[PDB]
Design a protein around this ligand. Structure first.
Ligand SMILES: [Zn+2]
Length: 66
DNA sequence: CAGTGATAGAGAC
DNA sequence: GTCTCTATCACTG
């Protein structure tokens, strides 16, 4: 809305992924995509980035409760 | 309105 | 038949 285009300089320094449902941050201030943030923070150890992909699978949606 | 942390499901071999 | 990774939800300021 405020921006005329979604484009931007934001790039995942861990997997170069320029597309993601949400941008995460690290106590270093370096930008990270949602996957690296979730995987890197949970794993804490390097893992073949060859897993990353330029396509994101859309999952279903369901309220946690109620 | 946006972002985070936590939990669970699905896919491929 | 089993394992792993990733996304989405709800809540708060
Ligand atoms: Zn990334």
């Amino acid at each position: 809305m405020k921006n005329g285009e979604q484009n931007g300089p934001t790039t995942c320094t861990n997997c170069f992924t320029q597309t993601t449902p949400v941008w995460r941050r690290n106590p270093e201030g370096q930008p990270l995509c949602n996957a690296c943030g979730l995987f890197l923070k949970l794993h804490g150890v390097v893992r073949p980035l060859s897993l990353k992909t330029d396509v994101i699978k859309k999952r279903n949606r369901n309220s946690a409760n109620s």
